[PDB]
C-alpha cells in the first residue's frame, strides 16, 4: 500500500499506535460519532483522547468531519464524525491478528459471527474458555439468534458490540468482565435492536461508561440495573419503550447524561431529575420532547444543561432557576423556543448561554442581572442582546455564523 | 420628536388640506338640508336614506340612517364563512372563519343591498376607469357606508383602485375578529373614521378598525394603530352628539398645539411601528437562509435519486421508521423552517401586497414557486402517513394554494420556451399534488382488491378513477411535466404501476407500452 | 469660515448681485469680466409663460431632462432621469443656441482658466442653475480641475429641479457649486411648490407686481393675498407628504390619500442661505430646506397675516440690503450645529417646524450611519473570503477539471459546488440588502459614485453573476420564468453594471447604450439599424457578466436563426477579455459549454471568426 501507511504507523509513539489498533473494533466505513471513540479511550487514556484523535487525524490515520458547531472544548463530541479508510482499518485488524498467534492470548480480539456460525474456538470442549483480551469487539449480523457460548473474559476493559439484529440478548459472559470500564453497543441494522439481558452489566464494579446507538430500550428501567459506578450514559438514535424492582443507591456515581436523536422520547423520565450527583445533562435533536419536567430543579450539582435542537420544545421549565451551580445553558437550535425561564437572573454562577438559532426567543428582564455573561448566538438572535448590553455588567455577545458543508450526508 | 407622532400630525394636516372632509360633510348636510326644494303641494309627500353624487373627478356616495338607540342597542350578528346570509365571505380566514357586525348597521346594509347592488357594479367600473370613489356617512350612516365599502372590497389586486370610506362620529361596526382580519391590510387602509377627541366609545365587544382622524380644537391627529385608538377612545359609553360642522370649522382655523396626544400612547405606536418595520426587514434577510435550506434539500434529493428511492419516498419511509440522522435534520431543521417562513410570507402579502404592481415580488414569487414544487410533496408524504385522504381537494395548506394561484397568474404573462431536448433530471414537477394522485390511486387499488361485498356501482367508479389517473399520468409524461425521478425503482409511482398492472385490462394503453418497453428509462434524458 | 462652506467670498457675492441687476437691461444674458473672474448673469422674466410653459400639459410645468446631453442628471442604478421646469430649460436652450455668443464666451473663459460664475435674480437665477449643470456636463466632468470649477450664485430664484435632480448634483459632488440666497419671506422660491391651477388666476398680477420695471397700475390686495394663500397651502401639502415619507415608513393611509393629492415635484438644489435682519443661515439638506420654505414664512398674529403676503413680494427685492449687510449678520451653518433651536426661532419656525426640519437632518445622519454599517460588512474578512474562495480555490480547481467553474457549478457534482452555491446565496443576500437601501434612498447621495463600492460591486458582478446564470439554467428556471436577461437577472447586477459604466464613461460624455450600438454598427452585421436593434433586444451582449446567458439562449439553435447574435457576442468578447469582464482561462476549455457549442457552428463561420485560434475544431 502507501509509503505513509506502513511508515506513519512504524513511527508512531506508543499510545498513538495503540489507539490506531483500537480502530480495528469498528466496521468497514462505519460513521463513528467521536463520542464513541472518546468513551473507549477514556479508560486507558483519560482526557487525552481527543488529543489522540486529533493526533491520528493530523498524520492521516483517520479522518475527522464536523457536523455542527463542534465546540469540542465544552466536552461535547456529538458533533464530530470519525471515518477511517478501510485499508488502514484492515491493516489494523491484521496487526491485531499478528500480536498473538493464540486467539486466547490476543490483546485485541475482534470476533465475527455470520449466519450464526460461531468460530471453532467458541465451541471448544475443554471448558473453561478463558480469553486474555483487553479490547473485545463482537460483530453479529441480522440473522443472529443470540445463542451464546460460555467463557470468562477477566481482562476486558472495553467492549464494542456491533449488532445488526431486531433482537439482541447480551451474552452472559459479559458478567465475568470484572475489569470492564466501557461498553459500546451500536446497531447497524434497519430496525432498532431490542436489547435484552442488560442485567449482565449490573455487578461490574468498574463500569464507568455506557453508550447505546439505535437500540430499543426502557430508559425508565435503567436505574433498576444498579450501575453503581457508572459515570456517563449516552443514548443515540434510540427508541424508547415505556416498561423488576427499584434498587437502593441507584446510579450514585452518575455524572453525565447525553441523549440524542431519540425521536419518540416525549418526556424526561423522572429519575433523571433525581440524580443528585449529575454534572451535565444533554438532550439534543429529540423532536417530540415538548416539555422538560420541572423536577430538574432538583439537580443541585448540575453545571451544564443542554436542551438543544429539540424541534418541539416551546418553553423551558421555570425551575431551572434553582440550578444554583449552573455554568452553561445550551439551547442552541431551538427555532421555536419562545422564552427563557422568568427568573434566569437568580443564577450567580451562569457564565455562558448558547442560543445560536433561537430567533423567536424572548428574553426575560432578569437577564440584566446576569453579569460577566457570554452569549453565543447568531446575528438575528444577537439583536435583543445588543439592546440589553448597555444596562449590563460586562456582557460578551459572541456572534457565531454557520459553516456550511455536506458532512451530515455521511449520516444518510 | 417621535417619527410616529410627527407622521400623525403631518398626516392629519394632509387629510384636512385634502378637502376630503369638507366635500364629504357638505354632502351629508344635504340629506337633511336639501339645497333645492319645491313647494308644489303636489310634489310633497325610517329606513335608509342615500344619495349618489356623480361629480367630475370622483363619485361620492352618502348613506344616512335613523339616529341610534343609546342605552342598549349593542346587538351582534355573527357571520360565518359557510353561512349563506354572509355578504362578506371573502373577509373570512382560516384563523378567522367568522366575525360579528353591529346588527342595526348590518340589517340596514342588507335591506338596501337591493338597488344598490347595481350601484356596486358602477362604482367598480368607475374605479376600474381610474376614477376615485368616496363613500361616506354620519353616525349609523357611517356604519352603513363602511359596510358598503367592505362590500366593494371583495377583490383586492394591487392594481385596482380602491374606494375611500369616510365616517363622522360613527359607532363601532366590527368585533375583535373583524379587527384581526383587517389589521395591517390594504382593506384597513380604505377607512377614515373622523372622531372628536372628547368622544368616548364602549369597546368591550365592538373594536375599532381602519384609520381614525381624532379631532381637537387645535387640530387633528391621524391614528392608524388600533390599540392606540382603543386607548384614546375607550370609556364607558360616554357618547355625546358632536356637531361635526363645528369640528370641521375649528380644524380649518389651524392658527396645532402642544401635547394633543399622551406620551405613553405615542410611544406605543412608535414601538409597534418599529417592531413591524424590523419584522418586514427580517423576512427579507431570512429569505436567504431559506434558500440555503433549499440547497441542503437539493443535495438530499440527489442522494435519494442515487439510492433509487426518490426523495419523497425516503422522506415518507424515514418519517415512519427513523433510522438516519440526515433525514431528521431535513425534516425538523430545513423543511420546518421553510414551512413557517413561507406560511408567514403568504399570510403577510395577502394583507399588504409587496409592490404597486404585484402581490409578491419576483424574488418571493419565484422562489416561492420553487419552494412549493419542492416541498409540498414532503407535506403530502406526511399527510398520507397520517392516514388522511383526498389531499388535493381537502388537505392542502392554504399557503401552497396561494403560491400556486399567484405564480399561475403571473406565468400567463411570461414569455418562455421549454426546449424539447433539455435534460429534465432536475425538473420540479409542475403539479405539486402529483404524489397525492399517486397515493389516492394506491388507495383505490387497495379498495378494489381488499373490499368484499362491494357493490357493482361503486366498483365502476373506482375503476374509472383508475383509468382517469392513468390518463393524467400519461398526459404529464407526454407534456414532459413530471420529474423523471418518479420512475426510480423504490418510488411509490413504480409501486402504483406494479399493483395496477395486475388489475388493469384490455384497453389501449400508451402508458403500459411505455412502461413495458422500458422507454421510461429515456424519459427526460437527451444526448 | 463662510468661504469654507460655500466657496464664495462676498466680493464675488456683491459682483454677482451687481451683474444680476445689469442682466435686466440685457437680453437673455450679460457677461462681465472682473480680472480673472467671468460672470454670466441671466435676465429674469416676469411673464407667466416663463414659469409655466403654455404647451406643457402637466400641473407643474415639468419636463424630463434629455438623458443624452445631461447624462449625470439621473439615478444611476435605477436609471430614472431628473426633471426640471420646462420654461427655464427652454430659456437656457435659447441662450446656448450657437446664434448667441454664450458658448464661445464660455469656451474662451475656460481656455484662459478664469473662474466662471453663473448668477441671476429671480428666474434668471433659475436659468443660472441650469446653465451651471450644462457647463458641468460639457466641460467640468470632462477633465475636472480646480481652475475649472464653476460657481452658481442665485438671488430669490424659484425652485428648478426635482428630487432626482438634487440627488444627482449630490452624487456627482457638484452641489457644493450652488449657493442660493433667499430672504425669509420671498415668494418666488415658493411659487413652484404650487399647482399651476392654484395660482394661474393670480400669478400674472403678482408677477407684474414683482417686476421692478412695472406700471403697478393695479395694486391689488386680494390678488396678492389670494396668491400667497394658495402658494403656502400647496407648499404645506408638499411638506407634510415629505414628513410622512422621510423614513421609508409603511405608508398605507398615505398611499390611500395619494389619489386625492397632487403635489409639486420641485426640490431645493444646492446650498441655501436664508437671510433675516439678524442672521445668514446656511443649509445643505434639501428636505430641511423645503420644510424651512414653509415654516420661515408663517405669521404669529392676525395682523401679521394680513401683512405677510405683501412682505412676501417686497422681500423679493431685499437682495441689495442683503449684499450690503453681510458683515452685520450672524452667520451659521444649520447642518453643523448641535442646537438649531435658537437659529430657527430667529427665523419664525414653530417648534413643530423645528421637529420637521430636525427629522430631515437626522434622516441624513441615518443615511450616513447606514453607509458605515455597509462598509463594515464589506470590510469584514469573512465577506472577503467568500469572494477569494470563489476566486483562488473554486475557479482554479474547476479549471483543472477542464470545464471551468460555470459548467462545474452547472454540473453540481462535488461538495465544492455546494459551497459555491452557498457562498453565492450569502453574497446575494449582502448585495440585496445594499440594493434595498439604495432603492429607498436611505444611503447618502454619494454612495453610487463611491469608487471603493464601484470596485467591490464590479469584482462581485464579474465573479458571481456567471454563477447566478449557471444556477438559473442548471435547474431550468429559464423554462419557468423565461430568459435570464429579461425576468431573471437580479437588479443588484444591473445596479453594479450601471455604476461601473457611469464611472468609466462620464469623463468622455458618452452613455453606455450609445457606446454599445456604435460597436454593434462597427461589426458590419449588415442588417438595417432598427432591425439589428430589434434582433438584439434583451441580449446581454451589453454586459460581459451576462455572457453565459447569451450562450445559453443561443446554443443549440439553427445558426441562421441567430447569426446576428452569434457575431455580436464574438465581436465584443475581445474587449470583454481585455477589461476583465470575461475570463480567458475559463471559456475556451474543452469542458466549457461555450467551446462545445462553438465547435458545433458551421465551418465557414469558424474560419472567419475572431475566436478560431482560441479553440480547436
mmCIF file of N, CA and C in Angstrom, chain B residues 343-441:
data_model
loop_
_atom_site.group_PDB
_atom_site.id
_atom_site.type_symbol
_atom_site.label_atom_id
_atom_site.label_comp_id
_atom_site.label_asym_id
_atom_site.label_seq_id
_atom_site.Cartn_x
_atom_site.Cartn_y
_atom_site.Cartn_z
ATOM 1 N N UNK B 343 -45.432 30.102 4.961
ATOM 2 C CA UNK B 343 -46.737 30.404 5.524
ATOM 3 C C UNK B 343 -46.808 31.865 5.931
ATOM 4 N N UNK B 344 -45.762 32.357 6.611
ATOM 5 C CA UNK B 344 -45.824 33.722 7.094
ATOM 6 C C UNK B 344 -45.796 34.696 5.934
ATOM 7 N N UNK B 345 -44.990 34.397 4.910
ATOM 8 C CA UNK B 345 -44.949 35.233 3.701
ATOM 9 C C UNK B 345 -46.350 35.402 3.123
ATOM 10 N N UNK B 346 -47.027 34.279 2.854
ATOM 11 C CA UNK B 346 -48.347 34.339 2.225
ATOM 12 C C UNK B 346 -49.318 35.094 3.114
ATOM 13 N N UNK B 347 -49.321 34.765 4.393
ATOM 14 C CA UNK B 347 -50.244 35.435 5.282
ATOM 15 C C UNK B 347 -49.960 36.933 5.357
ATOM 16 N N UNK B 348 -48.728 37.356 5.091
ATOM 17 C CA UNK B 348 -48.439 38.780 5.160
ATOM 18 C C UNK B 348 -48.829 39.489 3.871
ATOM 19 N N UNK B 349 -48.423 38.945 2.718
ATOM 20 C CA UNK B 349 -48.623 39.651 1.455
ATOM 21 C C UNK B 349 -50.084 39.646 1.016
ATOM 22 N N UNK B 350 -50.896 38.696 1.462
ATOM 23 C CA UNK B 350 -52.302 38.899 1.169
ATOM 24 C C UNK B 350 -52.926 39.959 2.072
ATOM 25 N N UNK B 351 -52.216 40.422 3.100
ATOM 26 C CA UNK B 351 -52.619 41.637 3.803
ATOM 27 C C UNK B 351 -52.103 42.899 3.120
ATOM 28 N N UNK B 352 -50.794 42.962 2.890
ATOM 29 C CA UNK B 352 -50.139 44.117 2.285
ATOM 30 C C UNK B 352 -49.319 43.659 1.086
ATOM 31 N N UNK B 353 -49.828 43.816 -0.136
ATOM 32 C CA UNK B 353 -49.017 43.479 -1.311
ATOM 33 C C UNK B 353 -47.613 44.072 -1.251
ATOM 34 N N UNK B 354 -46.683 43.488 -2.001
ATOM 35 C CA UNK B 354 -45.281 43.871 -1.892
ATOM 36 C C UNK B 354 -44.876 45.009 -2.827
ATOM 37 N N UNK B 355 -45.680 45.342 -3.825
ATOM 38 C CA UNK B 355 -45.335 46.432 -4.723
ATOM 39 C C UNK B 355 -46.615 47.009 -5.294
ATOM 40 N N UNK B 356 -46.480 48.161 -5.948
ATOM 41 C CA UNK B 356 -47.622 48.744 -6.638
ATOM 42 C C UNK B 356 -48.288 47.721 -7.546
ATOM 43 N N UNK B 357 -47.493 46.890 -8.220
ATOM 44 C CA UNK B 357 -47.985 46.066 -9.320
ATOM 45 C C UNK B 357 -48.172 44.593 -8.978
ATOM 46 N N UNK B 358 -47.700 44.128 -7.819
ATOM 47 C CA UNK B 358 -47.581 42.697 -7.557
ATOM 48 C C UNK B 358 -47.928 42.384 -6.104
ATOM 49 N N UNK B 359 -48.636 41.279 -5.887
ATOM 50 C CA UNK B 359 -48.754 40.764 -4.529
ATOM 51 C C UNK B 359 -47.394 40.295 -4.033
ATOM 52 N N UNK B 360 -46.752 39.489 -4.823
ATOM 53 C CA UNK B 360 -45.437 39.052 -4.462
ATOM 54 C C UNK B 360 -44.465 39.479 -5.513
ATOM 55 N N UNK B 361 -43.372 40.043 -5.088
ATOM 56 C CA UNK B 361 -42.324 40.451 -5.995
ATOM 57 C C UNK B 361 -41.568 39.254 -6.477
ATOM 58 N N UNK B 362 -40.761 39.405 -7.499
ATOM 59 C CA UNK B 362 -40.165 38.261 -8.134
ATOM 60 C C UNK B 362 -39.312 37.396 -7.250
ATOM 61 N N UNK B 363 -38.511 37.940 -6.376
ATOM 62 C CA UNK B 363 -37.735 37.044 -5.580
ATOM 63 C C UNK B 363 -38.612 36.164 -4.725
ATOM 64 N N UNK B 364 -39.604 36.726 -4.089
ATOM 65 C CA UNK B 364 -40.555 35.944 -3.330
ATOM 66 C C UNK B 364 -41.445 35.026 -4.145
ATOM 67 N N UNK B 365 -41.922 35.483 -5.277
ATOM 68 C CA UNK B 365 -42.843 34.717 -6.081
ATOM 69 C C UNK B 365 -42.180 33.587 -6.755
ATOM 70 N N UNK B 366 -41.019 33.886 -7.271
ATOM 71 C CA UNK B 366 -40.317 32.844 -7.993
ATOM 72 C C UNK B 366 -39.735 31.806 -7.043
ATOM 73 N N UNK B 367 -38.992 32.234 -6.005
ATOM 74 C CA UNK B 367 -38.501 31.181 -5.127
ATOM 75 C C UNK B 367 -39.630 30.559 -4.310
ATOM 76 N N UNK B 368 -40.767 31.236 -4.133
ATOM 77 C CA UNK B 368 -41.902 30.566 -3.525
ATOM 78 C C UNK B 368 -42.431 29.459 -4.416
ATOM 79 N N UNK B 369 -42.441 29.687 -5.725
ATOM 80 C CA UNK B 369 -42.927 28.653 -6.638
ATOM 81 C C UNK B 369 -42.011 27.439 -6.632
ATOM 82 N N UNK B 370 -40.696 27.682 -6.558
ATOM 83 C CA UNK B 370 -39.769 26.566 -6.426
ATOM 84 C C UNK B 370 -39.984 25.836 -5.106
ATOM 85 N N UNK B 371 -40.192 26.603 -4.029
ATOM 86 C CA UNK B 371 -40.413 26.006 -2.722
ATOM 87 C C UNK B 371 -41.662 25.139 -2.737
ATOM 88 N N UNK B 372 -42.744 25.642 -3.342
ATOM 89 C CA UNK B 372 -43.956 24.840 -3.480
ATOM 90 C C UNK B 372 -43.638 23.517 -4.146
ATOM 91 N N UNK B 373 -43.115 23.572 -5.371
ATOM 92 C CA UNK B 373 -42.960 22.315 -6.098
ATOM 93 C C UNK B 373 -42.017 21.364 -5.370
ATOM 94 N N UNK B 374 -41.077 21.885 -4.588
ATOM 95 C CA UNK B 374 -40.065 21.043 -3.962
ATOM 96 C C UNK B 374 -40.542 20.442 -2.653
ATOM 97 N N UNK B 375 -41.336 21.176 -1.888
ATOM 98 C CA UNK B 375 -41.598 20.795 -0.514
ATOM 99 C C UNK B 375 -43.046 20.396 -0.252
ATOM 100 N N UNK B 376 -44.006 20.794 -1.100
ATOM 101 C CA UNK B 376 -45.352 20.258 -0.934
ATOM 102 C C UNK B 376 -45.371 18.728 -1.009
ATOM 103 N N UNK B 377 -44.602 18.068 -1.874
ATOM 104 C CA UNK B 377 -44.564 16.587 -1.824
ATOM 105 C C UNK B 377 -44.197 16.024 -0.447
ATOM 106 N N UNK B 378 -43.293 16.672 0.287
ATOM 107 C CA UNK B 378 -42.992 16.176 1.623
ATOM 108 C C UNK B 378 -44.209 16.302 2.538
ATOM 109 N N UNK B 379 -44.918 17.430 2.460
ATOM 110 C CA UNK B 379 -46.118 17.570 3.273
ATOM 111 C C UNK B 379 -47.179 16.561 2.855
ATOM 112 N N UNK B 380 -47.205 16.186 1.570
ATOM 113 C CA UNK B 380 -48.116 15.145 1.112
ATOM 114 C C UNK B 380 -47.732 13.799 1.721
ATOM 115 N N UNK B 381 -46.430 13.481 1.732
ATOM 116 C CA UNK B 381 -45.974 12.229 2.329
ATOM 117 C C UNK B 381 -46.410 12.136 3.780
ATOM 118 N N UNK B 382 -46.239 13.231 4.523
ATOM 119 C CA UNK B 382 -46.687 13.278 5.909
ATOM 120 C C UNK B 382 -48.192 13.054 5.986
ATOM 121 N N UNK B 383 -48.947 13.821 5.190
ATOM 122 C CA UNK B 383 -50.403 13.730 5.125
ATOM 123 C C UNK B 383 -50.888 12.301 4.911
ATOM 124 N N UNK B 384 -50.233 11.551 4.017
ATOM 125 C CA UNK B 384 -50.710 10.201 3.734
ATOM 126 C C UNK B 384 -50.247 9.197 4.782
ATOM 127 N N UNK B 385 -49.072 9.413 5.382
ATOM 128 C CA UNK B 385 -48.710 8.605 6.537
ATOM 129 C C UNK B 385 -49.734 8.737 7.647
ATOM 130 N N UNK B 386 -50.314 9.926 7.812
ATOM 131 C CA UNK B 386 -51.281 10.156 8.874
ATOM 132 C C UNK B 386 -52.605 9.513 8.590
ATOM 133 N N UNK B 387 -52.749 8.859 7.440
ATOM 134 C CA UNK B 387 -53.993 8.210 7.095
ATOM 135 C C UNK B 387 -55.051 9.127 6.536
ATOM 136 N N UNK B 388 -54.727 10.396 6.300
ATOM 137 C CA UNK B 388 -55.678 11.322 5.704
ATOM 138 C C UNK B 388 -55.897 11.002 4.223
ATOM 139 N N UNK B 389 -57.003 11.511 3.682
ATOM 140 C CA UNK B 389 -57.421 11.196 2.323
ATOM 141 C C UNK B 389 -57.652 12.485 1.537
ATOM 142 N N UNK B 390 -57.704 12.348 0.209
ATOM 143 C CA UNK B 390 -58.160 13.408 -0.695
ATOM 144 C C UNK B 390 -57.393 14.713 -0.465
ATOM 145 N N UNK B 391 -56.071 14.644 -0.672
ATOM 146 C CA UNK B 391 -55.213 15.773 -0.322
ATOM 147 C C UNK B 391 -55.511 17.003 -1.181
ATOM 148 N N UNK B 392 -55.731 16.816 -2.479
ATOM 149 C CA UNK B 392 -55.869 17.980 -3.347
ATOM 150 C C UNK B 392 -57.062 18.835 -2.944
ATOM 151 N N UNK B 393 -58.201 18.204 -2.677
ATOM 152 C CA UNK B 393 -59.451 18.935 -2.505
ATOM 153 C C UNK B 393 -59.819 19.142 -1.042
ATOM 154 N N UNK B 394 -59.078 18.537 -0.128
ATOM 155 C CA UNK B 394 -59.420 18.673 1.274
ATOM 156 C C UNK B 394 -58.226 18.936 2.175
ATOM 157 N N UNK B 395 -56.985 18.821 1.701
ATOM 158 C CA UNK B 395 -55.871 18.807 2.630
ATOM 159 C C UNK B 395 -54.787 19.849 2.453
ATOM 160 N N UNK B 396 -54.811 20.584 1.354
ATOM 161 C CA UNK B 396 -53.703 21.470 1.049
ATOM 162 C C UNK B 396 -53.661 22.603 2.052
ATOM 163 N N UNK B 397 -52.503 22.802 2.673
ATOM 164 C CA UNK B 397 -52.289 24.043 3.399
ATOM 165 C C UNK B 397 -52.489 25.242 2.472
ATOM 166 N N UNK B 398 -53.133 26.271 3.008
ATOM 167 C CA UNK B 398 -53.522 27.436 2.219
ATOM 168 C C UNK B 398 -52.336 28.082 1.505
ATOM 169 N N UNK B 399 -51.203 28.230 2.197
ATOM 170 C CA UNK B 399 -50.093 28.975 1.608
ATOM 171 C C UNK B 399 -49.634 28.343 0.289
ATOM 172 N N UNK B 400 -49.651 27.000 0.199
ATOM 173 C CA UNK B 400 -49.317 26.350 -1.070
ATOM 174 C C UNK B 400 -50.299 26.747 -2.159
ATOM 175 N N UNK B 401 -51.588 26.833 -1.800
ATOM 176 C CA UNK B 401 -52.629 27.198 -2.761
ATOM 177 C C UNK B 401 -52.409 28.613 -3.270
ATOM 178 N N UNK B 402 -52.134 29.554 -2.361
ATOM 179 C CA UNK B 402 -51.894 30.918 -2.824
ATOM 180 C C UNK B 402 -50.648 30.987 -3.687
ATOM 181 N N UNK B 403 -49.563 30.324 -3.278
ATOM 182 C CA UNK B 403 -48.345 30.426 -4.072
ATOM 183 C C UNK B 403 -48.585 29.884 -5.474
ATOM 184 N N UNK B 404 -49.369 28.802 -5.584
ATOM 185 C CA UNK B 404 -49.718 28.294 -6.901
ATOM 186 C C UNK B 404 -50.549 29.305 -7.692
ATOM 187 N N UNK B 405 -51.623 29.828 -7.087
ATOM 188 C CA UNK B 405 -52.502 30.734 -7.817
ATOM 189 C C UNK B 405 -51.728 31.939 -8.342
ATOM 190 N N UNK B 406 -50.894 32.532 -7.486
ATOM 191 C CA UNK B 406 -50.154 33.726 -7.868
ATOM 192 C C UNK B 406 -49.137 33.418 -8.951
ATOM 193 N N UNK B 407 -48.398 32.308 -8.811
ATOM 194 C CA UNK B 407 -47.431 32.038 -9.851
ATOM 195 C C UNK B 407 -48.126 31.782 -11.169
ATOM 196 N N UNK B 408 -49.308 31.157 -11.148
ATOM 197 C CA UNK B 408 -50.038 30.947 -12.394
ATOM 198 C C UNK B 408 -50.464 32.259 -13.031
ATOM 199 N N UNK B 409 -51.035 33.151 -12.217
ATOM 200 C CA UNK B 409 -51.466 34.446 -12.722
ATOM 201 C C UNK B 409 -50.322 35.143 -13.434
ATOM 202 N N UNK B 410 -49.150 35.183 -12.791
ATOM 203 C CA UNK B 410 -48.008 35.849 -13.416
ATOM 204 C C UNK B 410 -47.482 35.055 -14.612
ATOM 205 N N UNK B 411 -47.487 33.727 -14.521
ATOM 206 C CA UNK B 411 -46.993 32.896 -15.608
ATOM 207 C C UNK B 411 -47.720 33.200 -16.919
ATOM 208 N N UNK B 412 -49.014 33.529 -16.841
ATOM 209 C CA UNK B 412 -49.773 33.888 -18.050
ATOM 210 C C UNK B 412 -49.022 34.912 -18.908
ATOM 211 N N UNK B 413 -48.235 35.778 -18.272
ATOM 212 C CA UNK B 413 -47.647 36.966 -18.860
ATOM 213 C C UNK B 413 -46.155 36.798 -19.172
ATOM 214 N N UNK B 414 -45.597 35.594 -19.017
ATOM 215 C CA UNK B 414 -44.154 35.367 -19.117
ATOM 216 C C UNK B 414 -43.837 34.697 -20.443
ATOM 217 N N UNK B 415 -43.018 35.343 -21.250
ATOM 218 C CA UNK B 415 -42.506 34.710 -22.461
ATOM 219 C C UNK B 415 -41.457 33.663 -22.106
ATOM 220 N N UNK B 416 -41.744 32.409 -22.417
ATOM 221 C CA UNK B 416 -40.795 31.359 -22.106
ATOM 222 C C UNK B 416 -40.892 30.297 -23.193
ATOM 223 N N UNK B 417 -39.831 29.502 -23.337
ATOM 224 C CA UNK B 417 -39.842 28.341 -24.220
ATOM 225 C C UNK B 417 -39.181 27.163 -23.513
ATOM 226 N N UNK B 418 -39.892 26.044 -23.455
ATOM 227 C CA UNK B 418 -39.342 24.802 -22.948
ATOM 228 C C UNK B 418 -38.691 24.066 -24.119
ATOM 229 N N UNK B 419 -37.416 23.722 -23.985
ATOM 230 C CA UNK B 419 -36.729 23.001 -25.053
ATOM 231 C C UNK B 419 -36.997 21.505 -24.932
ATOM 232 N N UNK B 420 -37.507 20.930 -26.010
ATOM 233 C CA UNK B 420 -37.974 19.554 -26.060
ATOM 234 C C UNK B 420 -36.846 18.536 -25.931
ATOM 235 N N UNK B 421 -35.582 18.972 -25.925
ATOM 236 C CA UNK B 421 -34.450 18.074 -25.728
ATOM 237 C C UNK B 421 -33.615 18.395 -24.483
ATOM 238 N N UNK B 422 -34.103 19.260 -23.591
ATOM 239 C CA UNK B 422 -33.409 19.522 -22.333
ATOM 240 C C UNK B 422 -33.418 18.273 -21.482
ATOM 241 N N UNK B 423 -32.292 17.992 -20.835
ATOM 242 C CA UNK B 423 -32.321 17.039 -19.738
ATOM 243 C C UNK B 423 -33.267 17.542 -18.638
ATOM 244 N N UNK B 424 -34.201 16.690 -18.217
ATOM 245 C CA UNK B 424 -35.158 17.040 -17.171
ATOM 246 C C UNK B 424 -34.794 16.463 -15.807
ATOM 247 N N UNK B 425 -33.565 15.963 -15.629
ATOM 248 C CA UNK B 425 -33.168 15.391 -14.340
ATOM 249 C C UNK B 425 -33.640 16.256 -13.182
ATOM 250 N N UNK B 426 -33.467 17.565 -13.312
ATOM 251 C CA UNK B 426 -33.755 18.490 -12.228
ATOM 252 C C UNK B 426 -35.094 19.195 -12.368
ATOM 253 N N UNK B 427 -35.973 18.729 -13.252
ATOM 254 C CA UNK B 427 -37.311 19.303 -13.323
ATOM 255 C C UNK B 427 -38.027 19.194 -11.978
ATOM 256 N N UNK B 428 -38.706 20.268 -11.579
ATOM 257 C CA UNK B 428 -39.605 20.237 -10.427
ATOM 258 C C UNK B 428 -41.019 20.100 -10.983
ATOM 259 N N UNK B 429 -41.623 18.945 -10.744
ATOM 260 C CA UNK B 429 -42.956 18.642 -11.222
ATOM 261 C C UNK B 429 -43.904 19.815 -10.982
ATOM 262 N N UNK B 430 -44.572 20.246 -12.063
ATOM 263 C CA UNK B 430 -45.395 21.455 -12.029
ATOM 264 C C UNK B 430 -46.619 21.284 -11.141
ATOM 265 N N UNK B 431 -47.307 20.145 -11.264
ATOM 266 C CA UNK B 431 -48.414 19.771 -10.380
ATOM 267 C C UNK B 431 -47.825 19.279 -9.056
ATOM 268 N N UNK B 432 -47.813 20.152 -8.049
ATOM 269 C CA UNK B 432 -47.215 19.760 -6.790
ATOM 270 C C UNK B 432 -48.131 18.861 -5.968
ATOM 271 N N UNK B 433 -49.287 18.487 -6.500
ATOM 272 C CA UNK B 433 -50.116 17.484 -5.848
ATOM 273 C C UNK B 433 -49.979 16.111 -6.487
ATOM 274 N N UNK B 434 -49.133 15.989 -7.516
ATOM 275 C CA UNK B 434 -48.886 14.722 -8.194
ATOM 276 C C UNK B 434 -48.786 13.513 -7.245
ATOM 277 N N UNK B 435 -48.024 13.636 -6.153
ATOM 278 C CA UNK B 435 -47.884 12.491 -5.254
ATOM 279 C C UNK B 435 -49.194 12.193 -4.556
ATOM 280 N N UNK B 436 -50.027 13.210 -4.361
ATOM 281 C CA UNK B 436 -51.336 12.940 -3.801
ATOM 282 C C UNK B 436 -52.148 12.087 -4.764
ATOM 283 N N UNK B 437 -51.984 12.317 -6.067
ATOM 284 C CA UNK B 437 -52.688 11.486 -7.031
ATOM 285 C C UNK B 437 -52.198 10.057 -6.950
ATOM 286 N N UNK B 438 -50.872 9.884 -6.911
ATOM 287 C CA UNK B 438 -50.298 8.547 -6.769
ATOM 288 C C UNK B 438 -50.869 7.842 -5.541
ATOM 289 N N UNK B 439 -50.904 8.536 -4.400
ATOM 290 C CA UNK B 439 -51.351 7.890 -3.168
ATOM 291 C C UNK B 439 -52.842 7.581 -3.210
ATOM 292 N N UNK B 440 -53.632 8.459 -3.828
ATOM 293 C CA UNK B 440 -55.060 8.187 -3.966
ATOM 294 C C UNK B 440 -55.316 6.974 -4.852
ATOM 295 N N UNK B 441 -54.577 6.851 -5.950
ATOM 296 C CA UNK B 441 -54.783 5.683 -6.785
ATOM 297 C C UNK B 441 -54.356 4.409 -6.055
#
